Design a protein around this ligand. Structure first.
Ligand code: NA
Ligand code: NA
Lengths: 177, 177
């Protein structure tokens, strides 16, 4: 097996960068590049987040983002390894987890786009349907969600749907053209 | 990078088993099992090919078959590795190489069938069309093939179509269960 780091470890490891987005959004962005097979472009994007800074903290942040990118690259490209979305732990609040899920999708869709992939690049119709749903998940209002069984289940379902959809989109893009 | 052994070396390595089929057909079978996710079942098949012999030469034949099965498993499951079909080298006759391609396809479609995969197990229409083409390639007249560039590029094109198709078939099966 091969697993992403704990969510809060990752978040702490990039805190010094004072980024404008969540760990989850950032991971969604990485996975957008990787889904499109724009691996080298993803790496360049991560480098760019340092804005040329060269101190040891910034450097350690870079190494951590690269470790995550490489784990994701392997999970997305090897059927022997389960693909994971970097999201807060299950004991966080429903509202925290739902916002992070939405930001994950926003990052992923933006990543795809910046990597030159939209609706027309997909061979399968299942993929286009899925991209559209991810675009809706990205626009999701986390405050409507209500604590209890129903919405926990709802979040769990859309989260698992998104996880698989990313893998199917990736196969579509990679095995055509 | 990770590559299959040379056709000749593999064929020599299994000659002691006196198999009824060619190296290419056997590799097709292996890939049928792998495409279906029936890895353990394929392994038991390969082991049963020794018909319980335990002598050194038979055991080395088995090691060779397992090495090929494992290389294939990795190529089919890791997008970072190129998938290969085990086919005779270019030097050999056009008829001979067309024959081996056909036997590869026959082996492949038999492997799928044995592992419980036919038309209805595939989610995408494209996969179904591809399987149908592969069944036709298995029943292909190799004598008609005229030594020349037209039929040489004809063979190359269905060979490459088959190579890519196998990967798309696999992704269809794994990503819908
Ligand atoms: Na995987
Ligand atoms: Na591969």
């Amino acid at each position: 097996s091969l697993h992403l780091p704990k969510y809060d470890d990752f978040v702490q490891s990039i805190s010094v960068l004072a980024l404008t987005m969540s760990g989850s959004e950032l991971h969604g962005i990485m996975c957008g590049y990787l889904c499109a097979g724009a691996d080298s472009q993803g790496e360049a994007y991560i480098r760019a987040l340092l804005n040329n800074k060269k101190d040891e903290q910034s450097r350690n942040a870079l190494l951590s983002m690269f470790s995550v990118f490489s784990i994701s690259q392997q999970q997305m490209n090897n059927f022997d390894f389960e693909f994971e979305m970097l999201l807060p732990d299950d004991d966080e609040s429903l509202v925290t987890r739902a916002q992070a899920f939405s930001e994950w999708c926003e990052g992923f869709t933006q990543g795809l786009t910046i990597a030159g992939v939209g609706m027309e690049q997909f061979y399968e119709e299942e993929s286009q349907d899925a991209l559209q749903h991810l675009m809706e998940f990205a626009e999701l209002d986390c405050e409507s969600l209500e604590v209890g069984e129903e919405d926990e289940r709802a979040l769990m379902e859309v989260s698992e749907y998104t996880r698989m959809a990313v893998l199917r989109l990736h196969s579509d893009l990679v095995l055509h053209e």
